[PDB]
Amino acid sequence: GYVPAVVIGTGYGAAVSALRLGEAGVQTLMLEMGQLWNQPGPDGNIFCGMLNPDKRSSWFKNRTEAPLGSFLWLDVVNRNIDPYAGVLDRVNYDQMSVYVGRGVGGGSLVNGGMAVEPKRSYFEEILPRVDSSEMYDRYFPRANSMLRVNHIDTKWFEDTEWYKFARVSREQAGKAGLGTVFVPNVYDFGYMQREAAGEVPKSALATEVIYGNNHGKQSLDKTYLAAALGTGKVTIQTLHQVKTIRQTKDGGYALTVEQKDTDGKLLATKEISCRYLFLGAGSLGSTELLVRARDTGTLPNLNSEVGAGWGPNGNIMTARANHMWNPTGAHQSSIPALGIDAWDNSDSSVFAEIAPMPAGLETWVSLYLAITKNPQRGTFVYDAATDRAKLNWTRDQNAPAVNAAKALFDRINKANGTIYRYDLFGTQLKAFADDFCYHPLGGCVLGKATDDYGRVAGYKNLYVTDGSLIPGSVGVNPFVTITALAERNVERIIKQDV
Numbered sequence: 477g478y479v480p481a482v483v484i485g486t487g488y489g490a491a492v493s494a495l496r497l498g499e500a501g502v503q504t505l506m507l508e509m510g511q512l513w514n515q516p517g518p519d520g521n522i523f524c525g526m527l528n529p530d531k532r533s534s535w536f537k538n539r540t541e542a543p544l545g546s547f548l549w550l551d552v553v554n555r556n557i558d559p560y561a562g563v564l565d566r567v568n569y570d571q572m573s574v575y576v577g578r579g580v581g582g583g584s585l586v587n588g589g590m591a592v593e594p595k596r597s598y599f600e601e602i603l604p605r606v607d608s609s610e611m612y613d614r615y616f617p618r619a620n621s622m623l624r625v626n627h628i629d630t631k632w633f634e635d636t637e638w639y640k641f642a643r644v645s646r647e648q649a650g651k652a653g654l655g656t657v658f659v660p661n662v663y664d665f666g667y668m669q670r671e672a673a674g675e676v677p678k679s680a681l682a683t684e685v686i687y688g689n690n691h692g693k694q695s696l697d698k699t700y701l702a703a704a705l706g707t708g709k710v711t712i713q714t715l716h717q718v719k720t721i722r723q724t725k726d727g728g729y730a731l732t733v734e735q736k737d738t739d740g741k742l743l744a745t746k747e748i749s750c751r752y753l754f755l756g757a758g759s760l761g762s763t764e765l766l767v768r769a770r771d772t773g774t775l776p777n778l779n780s781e782v783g784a785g786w787g788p789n790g791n792i793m794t795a796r797a798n799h800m801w802n803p804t805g806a807h808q809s810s811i812p813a814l815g816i817d818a819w820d821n822s823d824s825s826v827f828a829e830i831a832p833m834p835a836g837l838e839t840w841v842s843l844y845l846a847i848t849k850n851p852q853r854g855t856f857v858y859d860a861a862t863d864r865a866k867l868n869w870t871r872d873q874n875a876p877a878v879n880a881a882k883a884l885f886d887r888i889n890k891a892n893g894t895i896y897r898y899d900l901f902g903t904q905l906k907a908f909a910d911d912f913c914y915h916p917l918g919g920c921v922l923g924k925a926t927d928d929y930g931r932v933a934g935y936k937n938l939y940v941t942d943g944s945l946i947p948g949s950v951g952v953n954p955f956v957t958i959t960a961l962a963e964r965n966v967e968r969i970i971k972q973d974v
């Protein structure tokens with residue numbers, strides 16, 4: 477049926493949008509293709525850990541996979557599984573694998589919780605049409621508070637075995653002249669201290685993050701979505717995937733929506749219509765819906781920028797082998813706390829997470845997720861034969877990202893007399909993983925496919941809210957930027973359009 481507003485998805489853009497709609501008194505239905513993650517499973521927990529993956533780990537795959545970087549230690553725990561509506565989806569394109577969350581809360585269920593504001597000068601570079609003062613004065617603070625961002629205690633961090641891995645890389649980086657920074661998080665660091673003291677159930681300190689955290693992490697189901705439901709004006713329907721969007725003859729929008737069970741069986745196909753339609757299906761999901769609608773003729777007025785301008789936030793993974801006298805520890809918190817900030821907005825910029833590893837015994841490896849500034853972009857191109865929007869990105873397009881990451885880590889290796897690992901990503905000698913993405917950005921870029929508030933060009937009352945808006949790069953972990961932009965956009969859309 478009819479509902480005044482529909483929001484597709486339940487990640488960051490969607491959650492912000494639905495809260496503010498509900499507070500404005502607009503009855504809003506959110507459609508989420510994944511599950512509401514609140515049922516204890518066979519181990520009594522909602523989510524599987526990284527050392528006991530099961531079908532809950534994976535969106536319709538037939539075998540579990542090791543977290544990237546950890547195959548040498550964690551393939552031993554992989555098992556065949558039934559295809560199921562699990563929480564983490566590795567979306568394979570021809571030369572890129574994009575990892576996304578599936579469920580109520582989207583990527584907030586599976587991400588590392590790192591809540592970081594972009595550098596203002598870089599924000600101003602990437603989005604020159606946006607008033608940066610309102611962003612830094614009003615919308616970034618609002619996002620920080622609503623997300624429940626918090627900060628690690630420095631003394632605890634310095635003393636705990638669970639962050640030795642971080643301290644080792646800080647010392648090594650320091651020998652090369654390179655500094656680190658603490659990274660704020662939505663994981664409750666007070667809870668984490670209590671975990672280490674044996675006072676509360678472990679999650680971060682029990683090798684959980686990428687298939688969900690059973691405790692501690694303030695994902696969006698606890699923050700924005702809980703608040704949205706609290707307005708009395710928002711409902712969420714799960715295992716509902718929007719397939720098509722059209723403009724109805726009498727106004728508004730009509731959606732074809734498939735309802736499935738957790739085994740993927742089709743239960744019903746429904747028609748849902750609305751006055752206001754907000755897309756929060758992510759960089760991949762929102763872009764696919766709009767490229768499909770353009771190229772199958774159901775939203776024929778969409779422009780040529782729909783599909784364009786995608787980048788992986790410069791994501792590159794690499795690892796260094798420590799000296800024997802610098803073990804990183806068998807006990808590594810699954811939530812990162814430190815990064816190396818070598819980001820100056822130049823082409824050599826690197827912001828790199830000091831990433832924990834879950835093996836559980838000493839391996840001497842330091843792992844890093846680098847964020848770089850690489851101008852290359854891909855395009856989503858509709859394939860009518862398979863009804864899928866294919867990403868045309870080629871691995872050589874990540875050469876500038878690899879080059880930037882390698883120049884930085886070469887400095888660290890030179891200063892310390894260490895070498896890379898070459899065996900973490902596959903059998904072929906490969907020190908830099910250059911065909912994955914945790915931070916997809918773009919596809920429906922703000923001001924190009926849309927106006928400067930995410931109103932889709934060619935249409936009224938049609939909005940995009942999410943990572944698809946961002947022009948390929950933010951220089952930091954992206955969810956705070958997505959959240960703050962969504963706060964700006966929905967406030968303005970409600971004032972002028974609703």
Ligand SMILES: Cc1cc2nc3c(=O)[nH]c(=O)nc-3n(C[C@H](O)[C@H](O)[C@H](O)COP(=O)(O)OP(=O)(O)OC[C@H]3O[C@@H](n4cnc5c(N)ncnc54)[C@H](O)[C@@H]3O)c2cc1C
Pocket residue numbers: 484485486487488489490507508509510575576577578579580581582583584586587588589590591592686716717718719756757758759761762765914915916942943944952953954955956958
């Ligand atoms: C392993 C990993 C680690 C990360 N670590 C961090 C980190 O620490 N900090 C950081 O800032 N970012 C991190 N990220 C990135 C961050 O999670 C994303 O940038 C963010 O979640 C994107 O928000 P979004 O609103 O664009 O979309 P998403 O959060 O991806 O949400 C989209 C939602 O829409 C649903 N959906 C999609 N298509 C449809 C459809 N057709 N119909 C219905 N529902 C649909 C999805 O199932 C999903 O729930 C990480 C991500 C991963 C995968």
